[PDB]
Amino acid sequence: KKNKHKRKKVKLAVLKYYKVDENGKISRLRRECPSDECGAGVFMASHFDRHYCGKCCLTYCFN
Amino acid sequence: RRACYGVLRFIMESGAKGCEVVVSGKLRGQRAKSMKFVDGLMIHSGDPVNYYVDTA
RNA sequence: CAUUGGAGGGCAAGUCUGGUGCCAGCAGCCGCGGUAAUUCCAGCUCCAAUAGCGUAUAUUAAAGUUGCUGCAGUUAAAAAGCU
RNA sequence: UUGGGUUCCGGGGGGAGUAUGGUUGCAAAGCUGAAACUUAAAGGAAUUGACGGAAGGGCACCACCAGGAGUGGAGCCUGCGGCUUAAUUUGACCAACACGGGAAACCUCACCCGGCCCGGACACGGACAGGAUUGACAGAUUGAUAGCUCUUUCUCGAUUCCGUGGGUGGUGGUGCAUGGCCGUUCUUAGUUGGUGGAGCGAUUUGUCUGGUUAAUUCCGAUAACGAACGAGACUCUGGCAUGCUAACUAGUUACGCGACCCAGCGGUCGGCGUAACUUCUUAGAGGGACAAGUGGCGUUCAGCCACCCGAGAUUGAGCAAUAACAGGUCUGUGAUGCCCUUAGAUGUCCGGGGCUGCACGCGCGCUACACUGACUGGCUCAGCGUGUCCUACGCCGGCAGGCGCGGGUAACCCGUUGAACCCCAUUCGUGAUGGGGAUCGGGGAUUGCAAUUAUUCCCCAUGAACGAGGAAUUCCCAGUAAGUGCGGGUCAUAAGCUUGC
Ligand SMILES: [Mg+2]
Ligand SMILES: [Mg+2]
Ligand SMILES: [Mg+2]
Ligand SMILES: [Mg+2]
Ligand SMILES: [Mg+2]
Ligand SMILES: [Mg+2]
Ligand SMILES: [Mg+2]
Ligand SMILES: [Mg+2]
Ligand SMILES: [Zn+2]
Q1: Which of B5-9's residues contact partners 24+ apart within 8 Å by CB, and which partners?
Q2: Any idea which residues bear N6-succinyllysine here (chain B)?
């Protein structure tokens, strides 16, 4: 009986969530956090239908 | 045999009426053998056991 | 480039370490080994006698266990049934 | 310190006084007489134990006698074997078997079926801020709202991860490696040195002829003398004190009111209040009993029997020696050696199951077989002891229960603990009956996360064996056996058990 392998992590590079254009540009690509706990830092996710906050466990079913 | 005799001598010299030193366990070999060192008076039965002897 | 035998006791010299688990084996004799082997198989140490040292067998001392010096014979082996 | 004369004869045990040969005899047999082989002892004397279907003494209801209640028969409860099972975890065979305080729904919990976790310190090396690594909604997945995994992407930011090294945990193994603690020999009176004597010594005397005692308890004898422990004393407790100390968290009596009864400085009152008081309650201090007194018996000792007086003329326990036992416990322990395991864990958590499984055998118990009873009323009495959980009172419900208000961290409240049996009156009438209440159907509450393999509880129905128990055998002599109920322990729920009253 074969064992279960563990959760091998995905090991990605740098974040690169930031756009920059015309020598100095502000654009917040991923969505905001309405919680005051993780505001102005933590983004939300981008799944195929939803955005999700990795800290405050909050999602929006954008349907 | 040397350590228990010196404790036995040190109690009777210190002004005691009588003392017992009992050392049980694996002394020589692998068989458990007790060893008991006595001199002097020693009561065993009755109420005066409660306050004439102290055990440890 | 020094071996030959040993290290429980007789009997000089380890309750060292590893393996084996009444097996393989040792052991003249008593004995040891069935999972902490002072005794096996090994390493380390140590002992003995040493250019020699074990082993088998005959034999002598030990043996006042053949007794002349010197043994025993009530119950241990043994004085004849009696003359 | 070995020599009077002389004959026969032995040389570890067995084989074996066998084999063969010679000889004697009517025969039976006698005499003479090997070996091979086998074996590390066989044997003698004395010592200490142990045992004796050996003898003396003495003792015990874990022995008997005289008996009582029983158990063994029945149903059920619960423990053990066996069978069965995925697992039915395991220890123990007088001195195991209602034992592990072991009354397991889960936890306990080990066993089974599964799924997580790391709670792998520290040391080195590899990695790594361009990032070590950590946690995750929604889907897939799963017993599961375990990001366990997978899809998916967000998140923590040096705490960790990877690799050897090394630790740690373990209700894993080993009680025949041990500690400790228990139990037992062993509830009986037994045990030991010093110095002296007796023996080559192991050892012995002391520690005994006799009397006496529950007792190696005493008297008394005497190569022993003087001591030591156990016994005894002692401790708690029982039983008595109209004397002491003392009482609004104990009462009594008196008195004052108050109810009620039928007239009294009458009768009852756990109705109420305060005056003296400790008798009753509590618990301290002392007292008391010593075989003292009398009479017997006795070495006139030790002691024993009887009687007086007295609460009492042996209350009941606890403690308890030397030497032990391969007694039990590694499943009580951060008591523990060694071994085994150590991440796909024998660590640990979570879920479910099991420890209850039923052709059968046994042990401790419970309820019974009825009339010396059952039923239905009525009447009237406890004692230990517990409580933050114990409970008063009021409403609700037929019952289990519920809902309100209070009290008690307790000689204050429950609680004057209005307990059972008993006692008195009913109904029954010798019939497996109204005896017995197993089995089982249906409903109702409560505890809890969860009640199914019924947790308990209540109601209505169901109404089994059982008519005193074969061979066997347990326990017991005074407030004892037995009947009878009530606490404590275990306990969220809770006693057919045990421990106390
Ligand atoms: Mg030798
Ligand atoms: Mg010779
Ligand atoms: Mg000679
Ligand atoms: Mg000779
Ligand atoms: Mg002879
Ligand atoms: Mg003769
Ligand atoms: Mg001579
Ligand atoms: Mg011979
Ligand atoms: Zn958020």
Answers
A1: B5/B37, B8/B37, B8/B39
A2: 17
CB-contacted nucleotides of strand C (7 Å): 15, 36
Give the CA distances from residue A2 to residues A5, A6, A7, A8, in Å, rounded to whole numbers and listed in that order: 9, 13, 16, 17
Q: Which of residues 21-40 of A touch strand D (CB under 7 A)?
A: 30
Residue A46 tokens read as: 């981008």
- Of A residues 1-20, those with CB within 7 angstroms of nucleic strand D are 1-11, 13-15, 17
